[PDB]
Amino acid sequence: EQGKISYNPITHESTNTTIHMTDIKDTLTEVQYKIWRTADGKETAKSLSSKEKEKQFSLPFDTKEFEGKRGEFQIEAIGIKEDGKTIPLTKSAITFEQKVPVLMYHAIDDYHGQGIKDLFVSPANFEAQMKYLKDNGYTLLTFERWGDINKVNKPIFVTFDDGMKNNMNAFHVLQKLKDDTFKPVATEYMIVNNVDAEGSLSTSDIKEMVDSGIFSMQSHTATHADLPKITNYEEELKESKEKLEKITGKPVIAVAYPFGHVDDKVVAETKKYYQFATTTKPGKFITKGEPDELLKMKRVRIHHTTTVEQFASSIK
Ligand SMILES: [Zn+2]
């Protein structure tokens, strides 16, 4: 209704700032800022008062005042007159960017000597890892909720590469762990030409995974192409997306680069067709506002030998 909330510029590395108000029309003795973390809910709000009238009702803000937590904080300001009358001012928000681990799995199966050992995580160990997420308040997301990474507690993306049939084991584990509190979701990056192939997810598997609300079915190209070395970008990137959309009935907005192989040319081609692209560069993503950063997203590799302790250290 009146006034404008501003704050000293922050970056993704910032932990604090100072809030100010300008353009106030009423005469005030005090401004009260009601602040809460979106992720924790308005019911958890506190109110912080400034009587620094000569300094635009300056209010120091530090994430230390909110248990060291980050993400989006909502701000509602009211003014107080000398006689105590309250005056509605305005609302805004400030976001301290949260890190987002993007986990990379391949096979979820008991290894029996067939295939590349490191790329197998047993269903038992996968369950233990997912149970860790469940027990520690992580919010599992898919790229349809990219806009929510700062609006939830402990955002994390569980992803699988290739569309192996054994990923139905991961699906079943997630169905088991799902309950009134834990709402798991995950991304499957499907080698699109392998739908219904021996060893891969079938059309019926994909429909079950998608219809359950658990899986977001995204692209791993048409043939798992070494993108810097191919020229058929429409076939590998565009037509794979289109074919997969016809199968799932849901938008395809994300891809994973086969082998983690990517260069500026590949990013530019990918940008034509996908909003999101993940690499195999190790680490957690954070929003830096860097050019095409969402098409160069780091991932955390899970190994055959990864323990729950190692898993926890790599995401926390
Ligand atoms: Zn792959």
Residue numbers in the entry: 45 to 360
From the paper:
We next determined the crystal structure of BA0330 at 1.48 Å, which revealed two domains. In addition to the CE4-type esterase domain, there is an N-terminal fibronectin type 3 (Fn3)-like domain (residues 45–141) consisting of a two-layered (4 + 3) β-sandwich. Apart from the closely related BC0361 and BA0331 no other CE4 esterase studied so far has an Fn3-like domain. Part of the expressed protein (residues 24–44 of the N terminus) could not be determined in the electron density maps, and therefore the corresponding region was not built in the model. The CE4 domain resembles that of other deacetylases, containing a well formed groove with the zinc atom located at the bottom. The electron density at the binding site was attributed to the zinc ion, which is coordinated in a trigonal bipyramidal manner by two histidines, one aspartic acid, a water molecule, and an acetate molecule, probably present as a contaminant to the PEG solutions used in the crystallization buffer. One of its oxygens interacts with the invariant Asp205, which is tethered with Arg343 (present only in Fn3 domain-containing deacetylases), whose guanidinium group overlaps spatially with the corresponding group of SpPgdA-Arg364. The other acetate oxygen accepts a hydrogen bond at 2.9 Å from the hydroxyl group of the modified proline (Pro302), which was modeled as an α-hydroxy-l-proline located at a distance of 3.6 Å from the metal ion. Interestingly, Arg345 is found in place of a conserved aspartic acid that is believed to be responsible for tuning the pKa value of the catalytic histidine (His150). The structure of BA0330 reveals a differentiation of the catalytic machinery of PDAs and could explain the apparent lack of activity of this protein.
